[PDB]
Structure formats: C-alpha cells, structure tokens
Amino acid sequence: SRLDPVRPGQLLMIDLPGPELDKDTAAYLREHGIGAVCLFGKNVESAEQLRRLCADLREVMGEHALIAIDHAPSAMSLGAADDQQLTEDVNAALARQLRSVGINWNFTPVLDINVNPANPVIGDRAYGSDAARVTRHGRAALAGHTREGVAPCAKHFPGHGDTHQDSHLALPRVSKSRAELDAGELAPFRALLPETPAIMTAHIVYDALDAEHPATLSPRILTGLLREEWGYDGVIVTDSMGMQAIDANYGRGEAAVRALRAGADLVMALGRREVQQATLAAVAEYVPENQAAVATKRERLRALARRFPAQA
C-alpha cells in the first residue's frame, strides 16, 4: 500500500537494555518504526515496573506492538502428572499475569521431544520423550494462552530434541531420515498447526530436509515444508541471531536478509545497538526490491497483534 510502505524495522524483534524505557530507547524505537521487542530477566524487576515498561512500549510503538517475553512448574512435571486440563490451566494463569502487565506474546510451548536419554539437549523444558505426550500438553499450553489473549509461540521448529554438535562453533545437526522426522521431531508441530499462531525456528541443519542450511536460513524448510506442504499461514520468527554458532558462520545482516528471503516474517535481532543497526542497514537494502513479499510478512505480524492486542 502506497501510504504505508514496509520499513526494515517492522521486520525485526529487538531487545532492550533495562527495566525502564529511557528516552534514547524511545527515540530509537520511534525512529526506525520497530514493531517487536522481546523482554528478558534484565528487563524484569516487579509487576508494577513491568506494567509501566509495557505500557510505555505500547505508547511508543502503537497499535501493532508485539511485546514478547521469554518465559510456575516445569514442562517435564506437567508431562508426567499428565493432566491435560492442569497444563492448560497453569498456562492460562501465566497468560493472565502477562496480559495484566501488557505482554501479548510468550515463547512457549516447547514442542521439542526429549527422545534420547543419553542426549538431554532440552531436558526439563520438554513435556515428554515421545510425540504423543508432547502433542497433548503442547495443545493445552497453546489453548491456555490463546483463550487468555496472549499469542503463544511454539519452538524450536523443526525440533531441538536430539541434535549433535561437532564443536561449539558448528551448527548442530540432525541426521535422522524423513520418516523418523515425521514420527518424531515434526509430529507435534504438524498436529498442532491450526492452533499455533506463531512458530520459532531452530538454527539446526536437518540432513533429510536441507543438508546445506540451518532451518532458519532454509527456503526448503521455511517455504517448501512449512508454507507449501503444510499450508501454514501463521508467523515464522527466527531464533536469536546472536547465538554463537550462527555468529561464527555468518554476518549478522546477511543472515537476517537470508532468513526473511527463506520465509521468516520476523527476525530476532538481539544485542547491542550497533549490531541492531547493522541488521537494520542490511534489511533496508532488501526491503525496496521485495515490497510485495515484505508486505505479506508485515500483515502476518499485524494480524497477530489485532488478534492479541498488547494494550493491558
């Protein structure tokens, strides 16, 4: 649309320095039209302070604001008690607390499967060791958020449960066959798609899907599989681009442009202002030649915020 061209900042989710929205940060959000922020421990002191922080963010960012947080018993606990209704209700209570402070996005449920006992990558944070158990409690977690007006985001697609890292600088790999993936890693996401408004992708290489690129940078995975095979029309967000294995293998801006091209709607551009600025600069070169594609990405983000408005 002529009157409202897509800006590079509207495709990024950034982090903030502290518990208060300082003037320079406000000026910066407004300057670039940043539409999404993720909050962490460094931003959280009390419910009163957090409510003040999210109200300020909503005032600066406007009606499309996506205000996310990363993170009450464990997923393993709930998985084990195995009362689906309990899982839903605990997530419903968590979502009500988030809603009262002005947060409209939570990064759960984990749909990773803790399948390999001798390789607990996820551990406590998964609901179980098979797809069936993860699917059942994942459904409950999604519904508890959704019914309370908070967008949940399933992670980490296509499944972090059983990855192998050759070194701390190498991308983790999964070398299982497609049929194995279908029965395991992929099953909970596939089963839960119509209830999943957002999905966060994993910096993991799946040999059976795309032997050359991590999922977050893979057109075969984000577009071929998620969009085309599965018909997924929700938000795809990349995992944090500041994680070491990516950082050691790609430039920040290059990686973010590649994620958007591959099929992400939203890039998590976490880190100090200088790295955020470098990401903006790269996306600023991509956006003008890809206006229809980025319009579609922005509308997914906007549809999410309309459904789950931040204003407390």
HEC assignment per residue over the chain: CCCCCCCHHHHEEECCCCCCCCHHHHHHHHHHCCCEEEECHHHCCCHHHHHHHHHHHHHHHCCCCEEEECCCCCHHHHHHHCCHHHHHHHHHHHHHHHHHHCCCEECCCECCCCCCCCCCCCHHHCCCCCHHHHHHHHHHHHHHHHCCCCEECEEEECCCCCCECCCCCCCCEECCCHHHHHHCCCHHHHHHHHHCCEEEECCCEECCCCCCCCHHHCHHHHHHHHHHHCCCCCEEEECCCCCHHHHHHCCHHHHHHHHHHHCCCEEECCCCHHHHHHHHHHHHHHHHHCHHHHHHHHHHHHHHHHHCCCCC
Contact 244, 218 (CB under 8 A): no
Q: How many residues comprise the chain?
A: 312
- What are the residues whose beta carbons fall under 8 Å from the beta carbon of 50, sequence distance 6 or more? 19, 39, 43, 44, 101
Q: Where are the domains of the chain?
A: 1-312
CA distance 195 to 202: 20
Experimental method: X-ray
- Please report, to the nearest 10 degrees, the dihedral formed by the alpha carbons of residues 97, 99, 104, 108 taken in order: 30
Whole-number Cα distances in Å, 211 to 31, 133, 176, 180, 228: 40, 29, 11, 16, 19
Catalytic positions: 168, 239
Chain position carrying tokens 């509207």: 10
Could you confirm whether domain 1-312 is CATH 3.20.20.300? yes
Beta strand 235-238 with 198-201 is parallel
Overall resolution, Å: 2.3
CA distance 29 to 64: 13
Contact 36, 7 (CB under 8 A): no
- What are the residues whose beta carbons fall under 8 Å from the beta carbon of 248, sequence distance 6 or more? 169
- Please report, to the nearest 10 degrees, the dihedral formed by the alpha carbons of residues 92, 93, 95, 98 taken in order: 170
